Amino acid sequence: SHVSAQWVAEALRAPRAGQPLQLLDASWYLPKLGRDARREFEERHIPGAAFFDIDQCSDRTSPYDHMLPGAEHFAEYAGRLGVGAATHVVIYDASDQGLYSAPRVWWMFRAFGHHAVSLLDGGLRHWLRQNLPLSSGKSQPAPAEFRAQLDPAFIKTYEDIKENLESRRFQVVDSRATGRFRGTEPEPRDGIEPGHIPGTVNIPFTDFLSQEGLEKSPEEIRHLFQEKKVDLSKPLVATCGSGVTACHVALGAYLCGKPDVPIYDGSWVEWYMRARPEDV
């Protein structure tokens, strides 16, 4: 479920009984962009939206940022943002690319057992170009009761990726920019070198998106995967810098008929730290 701006605009005008919408802004940026996602939500957001913060809704113990939270934590947090069992969640972000971190939160809702979840195609960027209405300020919806349960099949761990270098049970696509993957541009985290996990295929997340910031068609995405030597009939896992834009690979495959693309949540930052490549 990709929904258009026009879909969301009508959903706002015309709710349907017993099945409320909750818009979430899940904007998140690497530090080097200098953006503050939460302050930007307060400057502007789509009316009714709440801010979903991927760095707060995450594992409380791990030293890695935005690792999947426990189910109880996820349910508490989503509930406090006004998402209940009956809620159709629609997620966007305000990225320059159209959607950047929203797919991650779409993927998290699915992983915790909530399938009534969609993505606003083109995000706030497209919304703004359409001259659609904005609100501002902090936005606190009525608390709701949410039940969550993690399906572990949505996740791959370091060990899984490590053992897969031998067994090759699944294909692995990395959605980072070509420069970071190939090791010719820096990783934007302190201490981490660029490069890639051996045997992975680079499909920058930007390849799934138009010039205008809109998701490509299912057939275009199909051909993208073909041109990259990835076979959608065999198992497929996605990885990136830190488990965020890898969810674009999961989304692209989903829209092609493949809903089972687990994410290496730890991603390059974990791989670099544990595997300690000396390559680059």
From Swiss-Prot:
Known disease link: Aberrant MPST activity is found in a few cases of mercaptolactate-cysteine disulfiduria (MCDU) characterized by the appearance of large quantaties of the sulfur-containing amino acid, beta-mercaptolactate-cysteine disulfide, in the urine. Some cases have associated intellectual disability.
Domain notes: Contains two rhodanese domains with different primary structures but with near identical secondary structure conformations suggesting a common evolutionary origin. Only the C-terminal rhodanese domain contains the catalytic cysteine residue.
Ranges in a coiled coil: none
Residues annotated for substrate binding in this entry: 180
Oligomer and partners: Monomer (active form). Homodimer; disulfide-linked (inactive form).
InterPro entries linked to this entry: Rhodanese-like_dom, Rhodanese-like_dom_sf, Thiosulphate_STrfase_CS, TST/MPST-like
Location of the Rhodanese domain: 17-136, 166-280
Pfam family name, one: Rhodanese
GO BP of this protein: cyanate catabolic process; hydrogen sulfide biosynthetic process; kidney development; liver development; response to toxic substance; spinal cord development; sulfur amino acid catabolic process; transsulfuration
Modified residues (N6-succinyllysine): 32, 138, 156
Region (Hinge) residue spans: 137-152
Record flagged with keyword Nucleotidyltransferase: no
Gene: MPST
Organism: Homo sapiens
GO MF term set: 3-mercaptopyruvate sulfurtransferase activity; identical protein binding; thiosulfate-cyanide sulfurtransferase activity
The protein's Enzyme Commission number: 2.8.1.2
Class of the enzyme per the UniProt entry, highest EC level: transferase
Modified residues (Phosphoserine): 27
Cellular component terms (Gene Ontology): extracellular exosome; mitochondrial matrix; mitochondrion; neuron projection; synapse
Keywords in alphabetical order: Acetylation, Cytoplasm, Disulfide bond, Mitochondrion, Phosphoprotein, Redox-active center, Repeat, Synapse, Synaptosome, Transferase
Catalytic activity, as annotated: 2-oxo-3-sulfanylpropanoate + [thioredoxin]-dithiol = [thioredoxin]-disulfide + hydrogen sulfide + pyruvate + H(+)
Membrane-spanning parts: none
Name of this protein: 3-mercaptopyruvate sulfurtransferase
PROSITE patterns: RHODANESE_1, RHODANESE_2, RHODANESE_3
Main localization (coarse): cytoplasm
Gene3D superfamilies, alphabetized: Rhodanese-like domain
